[PDB]
Amino acid sequence: LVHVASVEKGRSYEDFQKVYNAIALKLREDDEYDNYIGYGPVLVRLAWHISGTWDKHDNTGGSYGGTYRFKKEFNDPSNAGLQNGFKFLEPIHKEFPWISSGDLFSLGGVTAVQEMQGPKIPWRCGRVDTPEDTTPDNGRLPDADKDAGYVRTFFQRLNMNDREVVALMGAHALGKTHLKNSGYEGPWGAANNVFTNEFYLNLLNEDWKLEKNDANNEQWDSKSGYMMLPTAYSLIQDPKYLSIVKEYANDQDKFFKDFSKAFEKLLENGITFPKDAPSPFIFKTLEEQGL
Ligand code: HEM
């Protein structure tokens, strides 16, 4: 497969900034979702799962084709709970019927991170909706009960190196786990809809205890009422991962710059951009626009 980015016919920067604004105004408005966490965290989880299916070996999966719209991918067990972010974005797609699905699903994750005070993420338009038979089979997304060796190997398929894996994993300061979606339950920390380096500080400073939960899965629980997935607690057991965790725990600006680069790479894997194509867009937040 080659997947060439094609801009939506006739659309420029300001068209896309209007779609960003619609998502951002609806995030402000629907603030009650999930006990007042809001839709921000489930929207960056949606942008990572439609991107996370990519296989570097045959160029299949990834964000390009917007295939989460099809039943197979939509009903993937690993995607349970993401229907909420889909339903959030659906009125915005009736409003801007010209945007492709992969562009809208990835822009929703960019808008959520920046509206939750995260770094600016450069974004490129040009994904093209591909057919129902290009939809990847279930099972390409990662397990939660594994170790640092599994993590390294998994992310090699999306060719992410150690630093990019540790930067991307910082998104787990956002939102929470839900027992009915994944067999895990509890918040990651205290500031769950503000983008910060809290994941790393918690990993290095809490007194974590291993326990079984009500679904019979193990998780790490701390005295503060926070939890950690086994795959994510793995990052302090590997010496390479642990030196990068400590770097981000001490320097939130370094974490923001690295997360920005890594998240854009994740949302663009598998897509070829011609050089006639527009440069990456940097969207203004609602606040910067006075809206
Ligand atoms: C090996 C890597 C990862 C595993 C095993 C994993 C697993 C999980 C699990 C089991 C949940 C909770 C699902 C639920 O019950 O609703 C979760 C939530 C979440 N994940 Fe990950 N994750 C991984 C990587 C990532 C990455 C790379 C991102 C984004 C860059 C990300 C962003 C999120 C966010 C924001 C949530 C919270 C969603 C909400 O509040 O509903 N995760 N993850």
What CA–CA distance (Å, rounded) separates 267 from 52?
8
Among all chains, which residue has been given the structure tokens 């951009």? 273
Given 3, 49, 93, 123, the catalytic residue: 49
Experimental approach? X-ray
| Closest residue CA from atom 24 of ligand 1 | 169
Among all chains, which residue has been given the structure tokens 């005070």? 117
Atom index in ligand 1 nearest the CA of residue 183 equals 15
Atom index in ligand 1 nearest the CA of residue 41 equals 35
SS (H, E, C) 56-100: CCCCECCCCCCHHHCHHHHCCHHHCCCHHHHHHHHHHHHHCCCCC
H or E stretch at 214: none
**Residue 235 near ligand 1, beta carbon < 6 Å:** no
Q: Is 3 a catalytic residue?
A: no
- Compute how many other C-beta atoms are within 10 angstroms of the C-beta atom of residue 159: 11
Q: How far is CA 271 from CA 10, 48, 217, in A?
A: 20, 15, 37
Instruction: Check: CB of residue 267 under 8 Å from CB of residue 63.
Output: yes
Ligand 1 centroid–CA 74 distance in Å is 16
Q: Is the sign of the CA dihedral 62, 68, 70, 73 positive or negative?
A: positive
Instruction: Check: CB of residue 51 under 8 Å from CB of residue 267.
Output: yes
Q: Is 49 a catalytic residue?
A: yes
Ligand 1 centroid–CA 124 distance in Å is 23
Given 54, 123, 188, 220, the catalytic residue: 188
**Residue 72 near ligand 1, beta carbon < 6 Å:** no
What CA–CA distance (Å, rounded) separates 127 from 250?
37
Ligand 1 centroid–CA 14 distance in Å is 31
**Residue 168 near ligand 1, beta carbon < 6 Å:** yes
**Per the structure block, which two tokens stand in for 118?**
């995260």
What CA–CA distance (Å, rounded) separates 238 from 36?
35
Q: Where are the domains of the chain?
A: 1-141+263-291, 142-262
Task: Give resolution, Å, one decimal.
Answer: 2.0
- Contact residues for 35 (Cβ-Cβ < 8 A; gap 6+): none
Domain 142-262, what fold? Peroxidase; domain 2 (1.10.420)
| Closest residue CA from atom 11 of ligand 1 | 177
Q: How far is CA 273 from CA 100, 124, 270, in A?
A: 16, 9, 10
172 is in an annotated binding site: yes
Architecture (CATH level 2) of domain 1-141+263-291: Orthogonal Bundle (1.10)
Q: How far is CA 131 from CA 59, 65, 99, 134, in A?
A: 15, 8, 16, 6
Q: Is the sign of the CA dihedral 7, 58, 82, 119 positive or negative?
A: negative
The DSSP letter of residue 234 is G
φ and ψ at residue 237, rounded to 5 degrees:
-85, -20
H or E stretch at 210: strand 208-212
Q: Are strands 218-222 and 227-228 parallel, antiparallel or unpaired?
A: antiparallel
- Contact residues for 36 (Cβ-Cβ < 8 A; gap 6+): none
Look at residue 105 and give its three-state secondary structure. Answer: helix
